[PDB]
Design an enzyme around this catalytic site. Sequence first.
Site, PDB file in Angstrom:
ATOM      1  N   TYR A  26       0.826  -1.196   0.000  1.00  5.16           N
ATOM      2  CA  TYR A  26       0.000   0.000   0.000  1.00  5.16           C
ATOM      3  C   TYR A  26       0.865   1.253   0.000  1.00  5.16           C
ATOM      4  CZ  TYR A  26       1.035   0.834   4.926  1.00  5.16           C
ATOM      5  OH  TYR A  26       1.669   1.094   6.118  1.00  5.16           O
ATOM      6  N   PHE A  36       1.682  10.297   3.391  1.00  4.08           N
ATOM      7  CA  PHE A  36       2.118  10.180   4.774  1.00  4.08           C
ATOM      8  C   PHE A  36       2.640   8.792   5.114  1.00  4.08           C
ATOM      9  CE2 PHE A  36      -1.075   7.650   7.036  1.00  4.08           C
ATOM     10  CZ  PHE A  36      -2.035   7.521   6.056  1.00  4.08           C
ATOM     11  N   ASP A  37       2.517   7.830   4.203  1.00  3.24           N
ATOM     12  CA  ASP A  37       2.973   6.469   4.448  1.00  3.24           C
ATOM     13  C   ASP A  37       3.032   5.731   3.121  1.00  3.24           C
ATOM     14  OD1 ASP A  37       3.791   4.106   5.533  1.00  3.24           O
ATOM     15  OD2 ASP A  37       2.017   3.775   6.782  1.00  3.24           O
ATOM     16  N   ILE A  56      -6.108  -0.628  11.522  1.00  3.43           N
ATOM     17  CA  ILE A  56      -7.316   0.176  11.630  1.00  3.43           C
ATOM     18  C   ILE A  56      -8.449  -0.499  10.869  1.00  3.43           C
ATOM     19  CG2 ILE A  56      -6.229   2.388  12.111  1.00  3.43           C
ATOM     20  CD1 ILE A  56      -6.178   2.956   9.158  1.00  3.43           C
ATOM     21  N   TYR A  82      -9.003   7.178  12.715  1.00  9.38           N
ATOM     22  CA  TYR A  82      -8.377   7.767  13.894  1.00  9.38           C
ATOM     23  C   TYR A  82      -9.299   8.643  14.727  1.00  9.38           C
ATOM     24  CZ  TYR A  82      -3.673   6.164  12.802  1.00  9.38           C
ATOM     25  OH  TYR A  82      -2.561   5.387  12.583  1.00  9.38           O
ATOM     26  N   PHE A  99      -5.908   5.092   0.560  1.00  9.28           N
ATOM     27  CA  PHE A  99      -4.915   4.023   0.514  1.00  9.28           C
ATOM     28  C   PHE A  99      -4.944   3.363  -0.855  1.00  9.28           C
ATOM     29  CE2 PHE A  99      -6.155   4.439   4.954  1.00  9.28           C
ATOM     30  CZ  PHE A  99      -4.930   4.550   5.579  1.00  9.28           C
TER      31      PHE A  99
END
Lengths: 107, 386, 756, 315
Positions: A26, A36-37, A56, A82, A99
């Site tokens: 991902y 961010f990732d 999550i 979150y 994602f």
Amino acid sequence: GVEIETISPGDGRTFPKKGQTCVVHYTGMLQNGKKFDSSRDRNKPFKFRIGKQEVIKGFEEGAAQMSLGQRAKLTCTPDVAYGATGHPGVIPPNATLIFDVELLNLE
Amino acid sequence: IQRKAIMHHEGHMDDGLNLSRSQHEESRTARVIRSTVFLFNRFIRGLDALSKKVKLPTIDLPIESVSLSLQDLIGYFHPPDEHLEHEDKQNRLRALKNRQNLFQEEGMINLVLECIDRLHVYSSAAHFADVAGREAGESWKSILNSLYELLAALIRGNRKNCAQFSGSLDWLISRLERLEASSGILEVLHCVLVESPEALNIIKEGHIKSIISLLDKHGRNHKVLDVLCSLCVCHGVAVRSNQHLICDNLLPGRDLLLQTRLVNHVSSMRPNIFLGVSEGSAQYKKWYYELMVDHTEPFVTAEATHLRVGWASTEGYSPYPGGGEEWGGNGVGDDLFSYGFDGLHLWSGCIARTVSSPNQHLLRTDDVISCCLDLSAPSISFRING
Amino acid sequence: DILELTEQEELLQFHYHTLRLYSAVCALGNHRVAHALCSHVDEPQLLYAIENKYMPGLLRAGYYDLLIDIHLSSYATARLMMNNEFIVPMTEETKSITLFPDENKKHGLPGIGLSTSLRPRMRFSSPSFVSISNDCYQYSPEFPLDILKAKTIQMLTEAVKEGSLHARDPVGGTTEFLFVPLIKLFYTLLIMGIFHNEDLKHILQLIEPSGLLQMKLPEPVKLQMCLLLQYLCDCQVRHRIEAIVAFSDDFVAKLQDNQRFRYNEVMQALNMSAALTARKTREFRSPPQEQINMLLNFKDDKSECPCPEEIRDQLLDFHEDLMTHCGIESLQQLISETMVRWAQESVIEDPELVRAMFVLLHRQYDGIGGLVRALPKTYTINGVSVEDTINLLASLGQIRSLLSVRMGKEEEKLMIRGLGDIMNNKVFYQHPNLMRALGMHETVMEVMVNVLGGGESKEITFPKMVANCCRFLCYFCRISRQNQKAMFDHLSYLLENSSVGLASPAMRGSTPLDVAAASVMDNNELALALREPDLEKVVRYLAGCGLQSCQMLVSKGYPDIGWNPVEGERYLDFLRFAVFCNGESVEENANVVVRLLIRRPECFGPALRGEGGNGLLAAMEEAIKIAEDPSRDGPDTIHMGNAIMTFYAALIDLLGRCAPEMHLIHAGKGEAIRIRSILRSLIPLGDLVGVISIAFQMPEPDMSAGFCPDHKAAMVLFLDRVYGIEVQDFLLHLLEVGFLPDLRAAASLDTAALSX
Amino acid sequence: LFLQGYEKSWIETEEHYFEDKLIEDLAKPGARVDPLHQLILLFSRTALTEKCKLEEDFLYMAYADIMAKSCHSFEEKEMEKQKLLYQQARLHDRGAAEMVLQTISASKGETGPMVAATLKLGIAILNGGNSTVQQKMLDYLKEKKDVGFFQSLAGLMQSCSVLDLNAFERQNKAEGLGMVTEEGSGEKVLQDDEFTCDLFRFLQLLCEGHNSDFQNYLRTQTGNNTTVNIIISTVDYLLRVQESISDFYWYYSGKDIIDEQGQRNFSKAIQVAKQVFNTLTEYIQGPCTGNQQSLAHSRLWDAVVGFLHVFAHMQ
């Protein structure tokens, strides 16, 4: 709350079930496109079980509806990822996530 | 422990008065201390008699006198030059250290604090002019700047004075948003934080939030970052509370500071074709062409391989269309002079919009796309696999 | 573009300071911020920035520093902290480097070979933000090390090749921006335990061929070369120590059995005479320290060495081997060459550079200085107990890392956990000398001083933090004989701030005064060596306590007695521990304690001493009477009457144990009789008999926070030691008035036994 | 235990000699400033940097000992006497004469391993009547009117060492009760006797020969403003050690047995008193009426009558 936009089909046969471990790849990103990732920079896929409450729900509920080799865009809502607190340092409060998940293997 | 000195006839046979002369440095320091405390009390009274109420202006406002005194006192604490001999530099360092100690042990740091307090009750030179006169109004800014210079010089090197007056940081960070003394107050805060680790113990979340708001309001200043670096660590030791506060209050939103990302090099290819429709000679205003792919890769190194096709306009009737200047991550559709399609979304002006299509998928290998373009009434169209 | 900042000076400086702030927010061992910063910049953008050639220089250095800080800094510091502690097991793999190749015309290579040394393991967690509830992220973000080391080798080769020709466009501006960050990354990589044998061979061939030390390098570059060479000497010192241990294994194996064999021989061939006892006292007496000291001595022509003369030659051979391995008549050669060559080439600013250069030169020239400094710090345990000692070393490293950070709530919790772990570890008891060699007591002391600092009488914050360190030091000094001597050195400091932790029945154990008492407890040598730079200080503290009450108590709501019976009682306990030892009072300490007490009469209770109150009888009954009346206490609270009774009992017990002795030396000494007369004049006998005769009740249980039966024992000891029992009617009267009621109350028990 | 005994009594047994070759190759300007000169300048700057306490400075403590051990039938006595001057000039012209003075002044009277090594360095640099080094030190002290050297010397002399009888009898009782290991620094009864002897030998070599200039400068530092008298401080220390010797002898009265400790701790104080007497003899050797009157109007007579009283009975 999480939605799925198929980018590439994965023959829609093998689906993740309870008591298994999926291997994904991902490249997460914020709503404004700010990445961010990602799981391709470290060059190691992300392995995780289904139904063990380790990732999550905004991710696992979307992964449980995909197939082997299927590329999808999972758009999540803040309360499923979150909430009103976010991730301290990275994710601001009340932020939606995107994602780009590709399932490599399903064990 | 104090024993009062009473003059009497008998006395005690154990006094033994021994003389001890003070050095020229100490004597001159005491004399200038007295001179400046007299002048500063005079200035304080003259400012109070005007700021308390509307009074007759027969007051002593030594504007130029206090300006000259501050300009002299600033150079009085000038650090030694280091294009200088080592021994001379050490002597000057010891001299200025003794000077700072003698000036602190008289409590004039609080005095200049009171002066800046009584001067901050205004808003601008125009606000001060019509109340204290044109000269005082136009010199208020310079007086404040010189006062902040003096306050910073009084604590530039001493470890004792900063730890003593650290109790006043609640006012410093509050007045940080004056917009006319921000530089001076930031310099004072940096020089007091870099010296005494005791001052970092009273820095709360409100102060860090105010500093970050100053960084957000006054633009990109490279001194606020040094202040935050000094707040993170002071003397080889870190403060986890302040580190966490900086981390979660400075860069969760990514509006500040300058972000960064690693993108791919994309280029474009176009044939020697030009289509200009207007009154007179036309070219049927109708065109069509197909495109196929042999081999493709979704992720070559780290990101999705950019692959779009479409039609791009020009500027006027000349080449070099407008858009991403060159050598960027912008292809077709990333500007208002091009219109592209990549299998999932329709790109126009670097803004994508998804559209429905039977079996909508990315442009995998062995894909046949057909671009049609009618000029006048309809627009560009794409057909995916027919 | 990233490279467009070369022209824009404003954005360049701003981003350089931003990178400095990114490094500063996670400089020390803070990983919650490093896990965020990794994604805040990137995983591979760091690699791209360290590989790119057209960098603005400042940004290149900033990215190098950030890459070092986020990933490598933590484990690098954790491995550098344990660099001067040579713990080595007795593994069969350890018993393989006993040759340490030095003969047949070779000297080996630094860092090449086998370690077999206890070193902190490295482990990095994978940075993932989609996983909810990460376990601890305790160590570091994961980073690929093979790619990083290969890129470092390649770029260092390219850098030396570019510097050899002296171009006018070094990478990143000048030559320092090209070299310093690259050498720093290579140095921290070499520190953190990578570059296996072949890689280190190539890294050596980079500089050694007789390169990098022969070039014209700037001051910040040679400053890093100095640290590189320092590590290159440290690894050689470690290898020498490992070889010494490997040889010592076989040497002890051949010596212990030979000693036991000669003992068995001399025992079977008895031939009992007057010299056999002198020969065989060495086996029972002469503990192993002096035993080995006297059985290992042959540097002169002859000493009293036993019959195993064969091992003497092998020891001399190994000693000459170590001497020729050291600099005593090829790394020392070229290091000493370069160090003097730089200074002869040019005068050197940046005094840190010349300091590092000269310490390196002195180290190379002395050689055996490192050995004599490091051999006290080496240790060997076994091949079986490895996991326990590794966990102990990890916990100690965590303790030191928390020491390196300012004290907070989470820091206090982590250090309490680490102290509990190191106390529960078994090596803490199985090898007490290991803790002394590691300096655990000093580390705990230097942490506790940080908490005890700040103020003196205005804040005692982090009481659990001071208590855990106090109790750990107490246990450490308790389970030993030499650790008491070790803590006796720091005893001088803690007595100055011993006033903390008192006036509160929450820490009857952990206290600096209590750790002083535990260090000085039950050791005649230490009780003697306890001279008087601090007894007068303790007496002054006792006088201040007996003159002023506790503001904390008067704030809690106590009736504000004109004196304080708690800190005074603690001081009396410490003085009792200092004066009484093993059942015999130390005469010098007792005499000076009496002298100080009579010089400062405020130390005694105001009801006993002074122009006001009469003495112990009325004092004790008034204290009982206060204890019965709840109107003179805190409306688990401090019973003021019980506290006064305990203070007076402690003072009387101190004076009794301070009485000269049972007339062994008092029969023929004068100053002992003088001290006895002083005690007799200070404490009357009628007061003592009256205080003994109180006949406390015998109670459905009751509360023992009143006239405790242990208060009578102090008066009994004082009567036995100061006055004694030698008169018949005196004995009979004491038995009638002070012994029969208590004896009856004790004998009247069937099942209700609440007080043993 | 084997490795402990090995590191205790096998490795540090004087197995090297390099303190001369090292400095010889360090003073060669192969090609400015020599490396040894750079080192001396580094030490001088470190000692001149204003602080509040002299740090440990392991580098200085290790290099001062090497520089001190670098130094030291008619021709066989003249050649060595000239080579000693050569070895002293090998480093006293590079700034060591001022470096030692600055190191002593930067300690303001704190007895530590830094002064304990700089005094040995001064001894090695002033061995014999090196009038050149004496004049260099005097010119430096007179051109830089610093008191922090003389007041530091006074503070050092005020706290050198005194034989205390209480600690001696306490250690004796400890030995009688148990076989406690012996203390290294003279059984904790005479602290740094070697340091005291080195300090007074340095004060003696500063005035050796007949250097009247330094003999008068040690009495009155003419040019400064808070001059301190070194002769009076030496007399006070001599009186202290005389009272100490008197008490230690009064302890050994009636008992005609002098044990090993009673011999060693006595010989140490004997040597210290002998060194103090030699220092006073060098102070008043030249006919300096100043020091003559200073010794006349002081407490030297009490010390000498105490010494007479102890001698008449010890003999």
